[PDB]
C-alpha cells in the first residue's frame, strides 16, 4: 500500500466498514513504536480525553500541544493542561485577524525512529466518533547513522518542506522538533507537503504556501493530457460577491494547473438531519447565515455527501479533500487530503494588485502525485495502483428542495435521527 491513506473508525456502522480504519488509540499504540515524546498540532483540544488516548505505559512521556488560542481560551487550555506535568504548550503566533491554527499533525518520536501523522481531526471525542475523517501515516523513519553523511531527503522534498513549515512558526519548542527531524531519514516519503502559514507573501515566496504552492507542484510534477476539479470541505469562507472574485479566478486556476467543471461537496440539511449524529453533526460544519446570504451563487456548485463506497454516507465529513478526476471519474491526476477548508483564510487571496498573497491561517496537507509513484494517473478504487477515494463518484447535485447546512439558523420542521430539533442560541 503506497498511499497510507486511512479513514478514522466510525462507531455504529458494520465492522467491515471499520476493517481498514484507524482510531487514535490505534495510531498511538505500542505496535506503532515505543514512544519517547510527541507533538500534537491542532485547533481544538480536550486535554483529558487526549491523554487517555495514549496507552497507559506512554501517558507520562512528554507531550507538546501546538495550538492558536488567545486570552481566556488560552487560559482555559493551560488550565486543562496543568494537572499533567508532562505536557507543554506552544502558542502559534496568529498576527493576522480571523486566522486559526488549523493544522492537524502528530510528530511521534520513538526509540526506533520517528513518525509523522497528518490528518483532519480535532483532538476531541466527537471528531473521532461518527465522522468521516482522513489520516496519512508516514513510514517509520529511521535515525541517521551517527557515523554517516546523508541528507535523509525524499524526491518530494518532504523533509526540507516540513522543516520550513515548522520554521515559519518561529517557536522555541518547535526548534527542538526541527532538530529531531534533521536527524532522521525521511527519504522513503512519496507525498508532497502543502502548507499554509499566516502572512503576506511577495515575489518568489508566493509559491511557498497555499494554493500557489499547489499550483507550483502541479506545474512542476504533473503533466497535461475537460477533467473536472473536485473540492470537498466542512467549512466555507466568504468567497466574494460572485464566482469571478476568487473561486473561479485564482482558486480554480491553481487547481486546474497541470504541467472545466467544478464540483463542490458540502453536506445538505438532509445529509445532516439523517446522519448518525443528527443535527449536532452541524456543530462541526460552521457555515453561517451571515456568510451564506452574501454568496447565494456558490450553492449551485454544491453537491451532496454520499459515501456508500466506504459505508459513511451517514458519517458527516470533517475530512477535506481536493482532486482531479477524469471525465468519467474512473481515474485521477492527483489527490490532496488536508486541513484546508474552502476559504481564502486557509488557501490565500491575492492582495495589492496581484503582487501579494495573503493567508490568515496555518493549514497542512499531503498531495499524492502519480509521478511520485512513477505513474501518470491513479485508477480510482470503486469500493473502499488504485487510490481509495472515500466518497462516491461522480458527486450528486443538490436537488431543488436541498439547502446547504447552515449552522446558526434553526431547523424545527422535521426531527433528526434522534428525534431532536436544532435551535442554536
Amino acid at each position: 500500500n503506497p498511499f497510507q491513506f486511512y479513514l478514522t473508525r466510525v462507531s455504529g456502522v458494520k465492522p467491515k466498514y471499520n476493517s481498514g480504519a484507524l482510531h487514535i488509540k490505534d495510531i498511538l499504540s505500542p505496535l506503532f513504536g515505543t514512544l519517547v515524546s510527541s507533538a500534537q498540532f491542532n485547533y481544538c483540544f480536550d486535554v483529558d480525553w487526549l491523554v487517555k488516548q495514549y496507552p497507559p505505559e506512554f501517558r507520562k512521556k512528554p507531550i507538546l500541544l501546538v495550538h492558536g488560542d488567545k486570552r481566556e481560551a488560552k487560559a482555559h487550555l493551560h488550565a486543562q493542561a496543568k494537572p499533567y506535568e508532562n505536557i507543554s504548550l506552544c502558542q502559534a503566533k496568529l498576527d493576522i485577524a480571523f486566522g486559526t491554527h488549523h493544522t492537524k499533525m502528530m510528530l511521534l518520536l520513538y526509540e526506533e525512529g520517528l513518525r509523522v501523522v497528518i490528518h483532519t481531526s480535532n483532538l476531541i471525542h466527537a471528531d473521532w466518533h461518527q465522522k468521516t475523517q482522513g489520516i496519512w501515516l508516514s513510514p517509520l523513519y529511521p535515525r541517521i547513522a551517527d557515523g554517516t553523511h546523508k541528507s535523509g531527503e525524499s524526491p518530494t522534498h518532504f523533509k526540507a518542506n516540513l522543516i520550513s513549515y515548522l520554521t515559519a512558526y518561529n517557536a522555541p519548542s518547535l526548534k527542538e522538533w526541527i532538530d529531531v527531524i534533521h536527524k532522521h531519514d525521511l527519504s522513503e516519503t512519496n507525498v508532497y507537503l502543502i502548507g499554509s502559514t499566516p502572512g503576506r507573501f511577495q515575489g518568489s515566496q508566493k509559491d511557498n504556501w497555499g494554493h500557489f504552492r499547489l499550483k507550483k507542484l502541479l506545474k512542476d510534477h504533473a503533466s497535461s493530457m475537460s477533467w473536472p476539479v473536485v473540492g470537498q470541505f466542512s467549512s466555507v469562507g466568504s468567497l466574494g460577491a460572485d464566482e469571478s472574485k476568487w473561486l473561479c479566478s485564482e482558486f480554480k486556476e491553481s487547481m486546474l494547473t497541470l504541467g472545466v467543471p467544478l464540483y463542490l461537496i458540502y453536506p445538505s440539511v438532509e445529509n445532516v438531519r439523517t446522519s448518525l449524529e443528527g443535527y449536532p453533526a452541524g456543530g462541526s460544519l460552521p457555515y453561517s447565515i451571515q456568510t451564506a446570504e452574501k454568496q447565494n451563487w456558490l450553492h449551485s456548485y454544491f453537491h451532496k455527501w454520499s459515501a456508500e463506497t466506504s459505508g459513511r454516507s451517514n458519517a458527516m465529513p470533517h475530512i477535506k479533500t481536493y482532486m482531479r478526476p477524469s471525465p468519467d471519474f474512473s481515474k485521477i491526476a492527483w489527490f490532496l487530503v488536508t486541513s484546508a477548508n474552502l476559504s481564502k483564510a486557509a488557501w490565500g487571496a491575492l492582495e495589492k494588485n496581484g503582487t501579494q498573497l495573503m493567508i490568515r491561517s496555518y493549514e497542512l496537507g499531503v498531495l499524492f502525485l502519480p509521478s511520485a509513484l512513477g505513474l501518470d494517473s491513479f485508477k480510482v478504487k470503486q469500493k473502499f495502483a488504485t487510490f481509495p477515494v472515500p466518497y462516491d463518484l461522480p458527486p450528486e447535485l443538490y436537488g431543488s428542495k436541498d439547502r446547504p447546512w447552515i449552522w446558526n439558523i434553526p431547523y424545527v420542521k422535521a426531527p433528526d435521527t434522534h428525534g431532536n430539533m436544532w435551535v442554536p442560541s
Binding site: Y43, C44, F45, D46, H67, D69, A73, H76, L77, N122, I124, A126, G283, S284, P286
Partner: peptide, 5 residues
Amino acid sequence: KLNYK
C-alpha cells in the same frame, strides 16, 4: 478550545 461553538 473544546469546539467551534
